[PDB]
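Note on ligand handling. Small-molecule inputs were canonicalized before submission; formal charges were left as drawn, and no protonation-state enumeration was performed. Where a ligand contained multiple stereocentres, the stereochemistry in the source SMILES was retained. For magnesium ion, this procedure yielded the string shown in the input block below.
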Amino acid sequence: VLQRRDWENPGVTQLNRLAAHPPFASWRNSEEARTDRPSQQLRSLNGEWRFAWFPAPEAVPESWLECDLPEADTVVVPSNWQMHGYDAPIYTNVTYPITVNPPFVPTENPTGCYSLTFNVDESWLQEGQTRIIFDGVNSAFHLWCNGRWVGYGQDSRLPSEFDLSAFLRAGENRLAVMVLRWSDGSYLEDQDMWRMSGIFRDVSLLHKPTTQISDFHVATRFNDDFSRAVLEAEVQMCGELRDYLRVTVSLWQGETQVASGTAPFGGEIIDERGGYADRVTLRLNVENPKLWSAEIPNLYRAVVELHTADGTLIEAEACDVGFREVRIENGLLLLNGKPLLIRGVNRHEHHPLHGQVMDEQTMVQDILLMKQNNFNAVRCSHYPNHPLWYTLCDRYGLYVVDEANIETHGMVPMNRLTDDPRWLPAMSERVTRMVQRDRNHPSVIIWSLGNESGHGANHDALYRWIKSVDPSRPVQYEGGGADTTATDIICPMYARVDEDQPFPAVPKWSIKKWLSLPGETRPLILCEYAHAMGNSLGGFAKYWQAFRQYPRLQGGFVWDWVDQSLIKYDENGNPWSAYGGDFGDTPNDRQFCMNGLVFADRTPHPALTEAKHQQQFFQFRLSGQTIEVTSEYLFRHSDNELLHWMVALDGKPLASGEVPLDVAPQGKQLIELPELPQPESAGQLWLTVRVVQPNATAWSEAGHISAWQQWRLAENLSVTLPAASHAIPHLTTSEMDFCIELGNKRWQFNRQSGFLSQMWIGDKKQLLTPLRDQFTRAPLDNDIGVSEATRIDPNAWVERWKAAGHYQAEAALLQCTADTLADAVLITTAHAWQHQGKTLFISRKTYRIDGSGQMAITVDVEVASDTPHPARIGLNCQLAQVAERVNWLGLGPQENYPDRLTAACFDRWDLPLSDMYTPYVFPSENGLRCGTRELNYGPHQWRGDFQFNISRYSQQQLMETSHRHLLHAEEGTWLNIDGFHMGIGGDDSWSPSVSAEFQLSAGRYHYQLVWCQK
Amino acid sequence: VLQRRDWENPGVTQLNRLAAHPPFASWRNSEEARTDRPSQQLRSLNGEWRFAWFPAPEAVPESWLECDLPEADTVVVPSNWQMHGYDAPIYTNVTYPITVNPPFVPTENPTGCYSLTFNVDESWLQEGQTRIIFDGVNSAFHLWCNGRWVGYGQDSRLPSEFDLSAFLRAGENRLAVMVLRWSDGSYLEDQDMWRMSGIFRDVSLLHKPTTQISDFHVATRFNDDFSRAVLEAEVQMCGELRDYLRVTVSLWQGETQVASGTAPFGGEIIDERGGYADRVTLRLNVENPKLWSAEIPNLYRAVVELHTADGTLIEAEACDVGFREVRIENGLLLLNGKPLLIRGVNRHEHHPLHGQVMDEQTMVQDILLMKQNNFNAVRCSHYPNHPLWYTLCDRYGLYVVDEANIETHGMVPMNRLTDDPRWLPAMSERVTRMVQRDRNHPSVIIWSLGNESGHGANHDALYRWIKSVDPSRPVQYEGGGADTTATDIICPMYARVDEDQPFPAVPKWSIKKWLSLPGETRPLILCEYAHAMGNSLGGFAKYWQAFRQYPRLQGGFVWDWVDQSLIKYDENGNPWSAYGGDFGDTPNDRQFCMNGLV
Ligand SMILES: OC[C@H]1O[C@@H](SCCc2ccccc2)[C@H](O)[C@@H](O)[C@H]1O
Ligand SMILES: OC[C@H]1O[C@@H](SCCc2ccccc2)[C@H](O)[C@@H](O)[C@H]1O
Ligand SMILES: [Mg+2]
Ligand SMILES: [Mg+2]
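Structure output:
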């Protein structure tokens, strides 16, 4: 066993492992099978095991096979051993975590030795077959039972089963399992995720009788309009064939039996030598079946019984059946004859405390949040999931892409192993065992051959294998340029809507152009788009506009669902969120492990609301007084839907109402609004509509909002003058300062810097820092890309801004003058920002302080045409005071940016100061609100047309701090008020992705603010 | 080694075996490569070996690894041990010669223990890599060198190579080879022929330098009228890449150099991660090439040289190149743009004294008799042949169908193993290693996935693998009714000219009717017709009338070339011809082993 080194040989992937099959419980009662009750024949071995860690498999003492080591600890199974402190988890994206030298692995190969002592019932050993099932072990393992060697397995993400009938004794039995971190199977598992190890899914014992059901498959066929179905069930047995053996398949809808069939064994003739004596095929007719879809997940229950002709049951098995048909016809992917639009997301199995151990409670929480945010589909990135996941997607309704555990991203070239016939055996076990496990699940609609492994002849061979054994689902594969002969669907990753990226050999065309290339007929579904790393999803609306307009663009899967951060503890035992490199792991890919729409504890990022709104199932159009509502449901009528409408004048409600929705799938409804009020007061009128679900569902509460939209109606411009004040502000001119007094208010302008340096109400100072121009932001993850201090990427935005001096530029005063008018004081300033003799920006300002005590600020900025476009053009200061609440009239309530603001609505918003900070784990610019007309904070009020952010953290502190737990609140409050702000991008995060219409490239800018004390 | 029982496990088909590649001689001189002279770097180990027979592998004494058994005999290698009287040859057609219980084999498993003592030159051990090549061993074997275990192999009809660099010493060395009659590979080798065993093809040592040519492929493309060709050569190396390494490919017609090309290593970009640093592709233009066909077998000689930039040769390899194009267009199989008419025969490797040992003299005699009787094509029934066969078919002019060693005729139903994904590994080694060995031969015009194994998803997977790595030849397969999605050609066996035979699931239509079934567009070539058993071939004229009248009937392969009878001796020592059952073999299929035209 130490001399064969099976873990360094790609030709050996298992020894003594049993055939793959759909999930079995071996019920001995037909009613228990029908109702899905727990089976006495399936025991869990999850719980406390003994565990010892070793640096290599040669360091494991020989006594460990016979008895427990004294130095072993007690640990919970399932678990990852890096989550218990035995060695460090490693976060690496592309580079393999070991030397690339296939098929050898390091001689330092951390080894986990697990053991369990357990009782077996007397009844289990007299008759039948006892097997052990390991649902997942990472990465390869050898198994012993009572000191004797049983078998060996590889592939971390599919179950491994072994017959223990010959090894078990009555009384106390002992299992010993030796798990290796690295194996030749590690070469095929280079997914972008934490690299961990252990017995990380369930362990169980199953008892079957000697004559047994060994496999069964369920298939459904329809007539042209889905009014008649045939359920075809193939059953195979093992053991001794007898003439008295019979198989019955019955189909249940709730407690009503719908169809039934019975036959003896013996298939029809297949070839010159006969047929399968040990198989049978039943056909069951079903009239007007209820169809399964993500909108209405109607399920039936199929029970399969092996019994004698005189009626004695031997064993029963069962599964959930959904009647649906998936096909590609004339370049469109169809479900039940209608074209799908995929609102998809990629999801990893990740928990911040338990690593890669999934429980039911976590899975249900992810499914409810997905459906509540208008997702209908999920991609298993990038391996088969825990078996309970597919059951939940069947019951709640999500389309699943099921993916083989094959990724060789770090190879050079990427197809070095997948073009080699010596690795064809290892790859075929990963594809064929996934299909034999999952082919009965209705939620699985597409198979995938894996991810990022180039294009090799091995992929073509396996594409054709699946089409032949399971013709009822399309196959997709992205490697080798996303449109090879190994895919039914064009499935690019990160292709842009309008812009081509012409890389050699593997170009990423714009998605609209890809469709129409000479010869191309397939549908296009992006397997990854809109990389959600940090403050991201800019330009998301542009994908959804294209998906709705082009029939053959059928949607895509966002990258991705949840941040893969882990929890660490500081000195005081306070938890904090950690990422690549925080465990001493090296090399590592730092914060690239956090790409989620939700934080690792399942709290939402602000981008989640942008996804929910673009993916809505109702679309709205306004024409005069008429709202047109269009349904994008394919199958359901809107029977749980109420339309609420509200008209408001600059935040104040004027009229409201509700109307029930009655709209057929893909239909329209016209709603006529009552004669709207005509107010005399100035301001913009706004109409907001929202779709509300009055009743609770399996996945949502009563009152859930599923869709919304907002429009401008009539506007009345203000033609009244400000009330003529009696008091005149007084100007005092020293050598150092201009000082303006009016009543208890006082303003001070510094004549050497040319900035407002202080302001008094009574005797209380209002500023800690002067009001100054600001042209920079703390860089987002999309601004940095793959750039680092070792290896600078000169094309990233942060690198262009640094090389040009934007972070270092010094303001030089050109002019600072004051003048008394009739009723006001006017201050005029000009500044130039320079770096090594080059002028980057010029700003010219006027400040007008009138008798009402208002200060009107006008700003004019010029930007040199050859400097990189600036991140923002605005003012900043640090206010002296801290208030509890922020009140504003503008887009809200959540963080919104110029290329991510469709989901935000214009209204009067009011939040505690802490909701104005988004706590991204990697700190950056955050919390901006756009389209704002008025902002109130303490005694201050700003009016204008601006974007702002307000918080306790300076742009400087956000840029210098790598983790959110290291930030500290500064004295007072930092306010940033911008006339203009650049987009955030997010098509990908490793190349510039801010579209030309969101860059500040106009050269001249103007904005105005009024600062008063109300 | 006795506790792992690798010969009863379809997941293990080899241990420590090197990658498959085209034939190599490792010349150290470009002229010797061009003119095909014998290479000092390739030694034959054929001759006298020591041999002992045992009833099972558990009966082999442990001392046999270290030293010769006193009770061993001296025998010639290559040989079948049943031809020397150690146990009986078995003739069975369909029924497997062992209990059908995959993947187990009988505990009584006759075992042949071969050994050889040999000298290795001092120069071979200082530098480079020494490998041993076994061209064929039936059915599975373990190998030891100087007492230490080297490796394990299965598949009887393709070579097995092992690195011996770490095991050899200067002076006297000893090989020990333990050959098993039955293995899980026997389940895939149910061809209709005598069931024999032993080291039945050549054994050799090859010396390569550490930096070496590890593979090369040759492809030819034409303009619309075959007046201009491009020869494309892909070369791969192993060992340490250096900037000074260069590859030259040159093309010779007789003594005239016709084309030449030179490049450093480094392929073009393939994907997001780059290209192959250890490969290069040369393109050579050739104007008015002479085309290869069975009527005029014009050959060129391609020499591949690995050398330094300053001109020092490291190693040379060479092969014969024939310019021809094979394609299917509008339902016709075309060679050099013209539709073929196949005058074919099936041929087994059989000799009445030596069993399944083929020599050059026998091969040449069969080729001259075939051409003298107006045959132009030969089907390798039903496994890859001795490597010299394809060289002779290139030089004299015969079209070859090359066939994978896969036949599971005695299974019930016939696709029990070829529809199971647990046997997909074992089947893929039989197909992928044949293609990597033979893809440079001009005479090979069609690949075949094997014979009589029903139709399973494993056949579809392997059909698609060949179309992707070698698009220049059609693929055929007869199982599952001769017209499945795993064949480019409809290729029935024993379909009649005018009469239908409507069997359930797998009907044999008349060949004229098969052509015109709704939807059918492929050419039809019979992979077996006109069974020549005894006094036979009545109605042969009726096939040839139909072949000439219908364009899409493009001929067929007669079953078969030579009778598989063996020689026995009577009391007076007079030789006589024997058939199934004459060796006490039971059950047997009697005279069904004699189907030959000769
Ligand atoms: O979340 C990161 C993404 O990285 C890019 S590679 C290019 C970017 C990169 C490369 C190397 C290190 C870090 C990032 C992959 O294509 C995506 O599937 C996803 O894994
Ligand atoms: O030379 C015999 C031929 O037998 C028939 S099986 C049907 C005939 C048969 C079956 C069993 C025993 C003997 C003959 C095969 O299909 C041919 O390829 C060839 O091997
Ligand atoms: Mg990757
Ligand atoms: Mg046969």
